[model samples]
Target: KYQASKNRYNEMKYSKCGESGLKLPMISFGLWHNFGSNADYNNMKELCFTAFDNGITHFDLANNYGPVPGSAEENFGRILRDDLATYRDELLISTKAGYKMWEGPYGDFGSRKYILASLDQSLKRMGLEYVDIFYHHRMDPDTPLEESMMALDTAVKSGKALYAGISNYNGETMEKAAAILNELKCPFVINQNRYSIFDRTIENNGLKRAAKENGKGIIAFSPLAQGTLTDKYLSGILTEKKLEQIRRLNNIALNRGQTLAQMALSWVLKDSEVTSVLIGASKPSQIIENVGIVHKIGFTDEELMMIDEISAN
Candidate 1:
């Protein structure tokens, strides 16, 4: 019996997922670690509530998100059933397949059987008939790309998913997957990748450029570079060179009236290719501070150039 904030939409912003009809919040919640089996149930409830109350309507999960594996989805399912069940339409829930889940050949990778069975298992764990988005978690060198993409297509065609997505794909691989999905008439709309000022694998790998060219949305994870971009590193030991770079970047954040974490999130989102940033929060306060980036995602030419140069150093 939880009621969402009446002004939930007042402070948050949404961006269209490429040319697709789906729209994702500027900040989406990721249940990658904290929603595990050993976590406090009430704290998990509070985290979900805080996110929704602040207009973070999307919740991202994967089959093996928990240390115990699948517990994150099961815990999230309890939160949905106990509190948010009545507001399901207001939320966009996504889950992924790939990575090792169980002990068997079929439990990992991108075979059609593995993909389809994983989706069904995820649905059962979440107690949902269909997820808003279903993603293939990674690339499998041994499997035919068409089989995996076809499994995603089957997930949608069977009404088990509204949209299909891919994670950890290179720019070249994504373009090829896009063509197959397009041919299959599947609504493959987004890519989930690790992107931050400190990490440029996507930029160097062609994922960033290809996403823009194909008109697909990119959702960035690890935008804070595993807390390296935040004040958390200020107190920890680091190389003098790395520490100097962080200090200079933090100075810019203070000038903008934002925390280093907020500035990092904004920096990843300053471009138009990324439609949303998936942030993993250990507590509700982190979500609040992360959401503060929505209105302050702007930077002058000089500031952008300085950030680039410092990050490169």
Candidate 2:
């Protein structure tokens, strides 16, 4: 039996999810990579342990997350069964559908059939009766928006999910979806999207304003630009110009006594609309490092202006 550290919550800062009673860690763990069948199982288990031990209670997943389709959930299921089952009530597990999962029209897209069926399959794979949150992984253009929102409503009403989420929808579409979810009396609490100083689709498309206006939370995925904001890059960032940007960011981070990665995560949290930042890490050390952003998110006016100036270039 794995005993979670007694001091788990001491190191974390939780933020409320919109107006909901639920709270999330400053950073959430995403099983987007390295949990498939071919990956090292002991290492995967250790990674989960490290995260939970450090107060990362939320775990994010998708139905088709594995390299071999659904193996990621299956693998995570084993960990749940063998180790973390005792702490079930303390964890927030989430999964998504809306991507291609299996052959045939019934297995993909935003249809009611696909979303409901996929949620059932995900629960079985994770050996859980319900997921903490369920999401439509991405927007499906051909499907009626009501049909999709109704599927989410069904997930919650059926006791298959506690909260509903949507990923990859733009500002305008998010408004439409939130309206429908509100009408159904569903607790649509959060929007998961790609956001960083380097990417501004959420800001440009109205998602930032929409979430703020509706009093909903936004959880950012890839807040680090896939490691471009960190020291992991060789040339730093993407190209020579991006390297210059990272170099400038480095100076700002040094002033805060935080690594460039830590500063990047801080920048994402500076926006009060963001409820949590999703971090993808295969190593335990990386989780510890990223979690450091919780207590060090402050930035000065000059640093903020410089960040905008360089990123705009």
Top-TM-score structure, candidate number: 1
Provide C-alpha RMSD values for all models, in order: 1.4, 1.6
**Model 1 lDDT, residue 188, Cα:** 93
Structural similarity to truth (TM-score) of each candidate:
0.98, 0.97
- Report the lDDT tens digits of candidate 2 across residue range 1-313: 6799999999899998877788989899999898987889999999999999999999999999878888999999999999998899999999999999999999999999999999999999999999999998999989999999999999999999999999999888999999999999998988899998899889898988898888888899998897889887644336888888888888888888999888989998997789999998888999999998988777788889999998895
Model 2, 280: alpha-carbon shift in Å? Answer: 1.1
Segments in model 1 whose C-alpha atoms lie over 4 Å from true places = 235-237
Candidate 1: tens digits of C-alpha lDDT, residues 43-67: 9999999999999999999999887
On lDDT, the candidate that comes out on top is 1
Model 2 regions lying over 4 Å from their true place: 234-237
lDDT of each: 0.93, 0.91
